[PDB]
Structure 1
């Protein structure tokens, strides 16, 4: 029932961290006043789940220590701090100067600073391996089914990007193809329903000593629909704390 406290300069990705903790099951409350930190736990402790809160420029150490010190035994507090200028500007030094001054009480006593960045948080809260690896690979039926695939799903019935002719040389990773497929509802239903189906058996497939679970998504060419769906399916289970890798057999000279 940890109380992961998320801190860091404005633009360092604390909003992304809170989202990650949200995926794990933590109750995330943004910009809550520090004084009411006990109240949240007491209200949430009964639910028997962990919680995470954000403390930034929006959110005097006496009240700070007092409020943190004023806390139920059930929940054990942990404090996190995130922290480059050229990168921070991209996420967004008159603002930084006050920000730098204000990042000292907690920063000096911070557990981690933590300065690829998306998944990195998974490594933080343990995780790794001795666990099942989920492989999501795209392929084209004209080239054949990957030899190692365990599940194969045909997506050639979905809307085709070979209909906006400015997309034929693009791949499923390119944002235009993403936006094209994203506007269609059946694409969202397929991703949702396919992973929902896999989650029904994912606890049962984890048994024994399975080393790999390879799910192959197939369209005709293996460059447009299959690539995008496989990546979107992979990204879903990453939010679920799984160890996954995606591989696009056609987009690697084959």
Structure 2
């Protein structure tokens, strides 16, 4: 069949290094893949007569097309005699901040990706609260003063 490893974790905790180690060990690594492509890729490879028997996926969880859990992926893989192995990368807040600050110097596009992942997680976490808000104030493009003006106007 196919061995499947799924890599995820916190920004800066080492998902990129885990993918590099797996590639070095002979895995085919699909990076930034939202979960839907896993089954389609496995089904494709099975039909494709692929030499690839070891698939690792670095999961794109910062996408609206991803529920909170992996029970959907596990059950669909189960119907094809595959039990994925899930690897989760984490670290203390102090370590993650130190790595972000180093990324600002050495890998600025990685640093910007880290901010983008944090904001995407906030938006997903706050979505039920947003959906019940009585007033939403969008402060895009506003200066410090324009921010104050817009809120004063919104509150009457």
TM normalised by structure 2 equals: 0.52
| Residue from 72, 76, 80 that aligns with 1:73 | 80
The Cα shift of 1:26 comes to 0.8
Q: How does 1:33-112 map to 2 (within 5 A)?
A: 33-45=34-46, 46-47=49-50, 48-58=52-62, 60-61=67-68, 64-71=70-77, 73-83=80-90, 84-92=92-100, 95=118, 98=121
Query: Which protein has the bigger helix share?
Result: 2
- Which structure would you say has the larger Rg? 1
Counterpart position of 2:29: 28
Q: Please tell me whether the aligned partners of residues 9 and 56 of structure 1 are also in contact (alpha carbons under 8 angstroms).
A: no
Equivalents in 2 of 1:56, 1:89: separation in Å? 21
Structure 2 unaligned runs (5+)?
101-114, 126-156
Runs of 4+ with deviation above 6 angstroms: none
- What are the superposed Cα offsets for residues 30-84 of structure 1, whole Å, 9 maximum, x if unpaired? 111212210111223432411000125425247x422331125354311110112
Query: SS where residue 33 of structure 2 aligns?
Result: coil
Q: How does 1:116-195 map to 2 (within 5 A)?
A: none
Residues matched between the structures, number: 98
Structure 1 unaligned runs (5+)?
103-254
TM normalised by structure 1 equals: 0.34
Query: SS where residue 70 of structure 1 aligns?
Result: helix
Q: Please tell me whether the aligned partners of residues 30 and 57 of structure 2 are also in contact (alpha carbons under 8 angstroms).
A: yes
Q: Please tell me whether the aligned partners of residues 33 and 60 of structure 2 are also in contact (alpha carbons under 8 angstroms).
A: no
Query: SS where residue 12 of structure 1 aligns?
Result: coil
Equivalents in 2 of 1:50, 1:58: separation in Å? 25
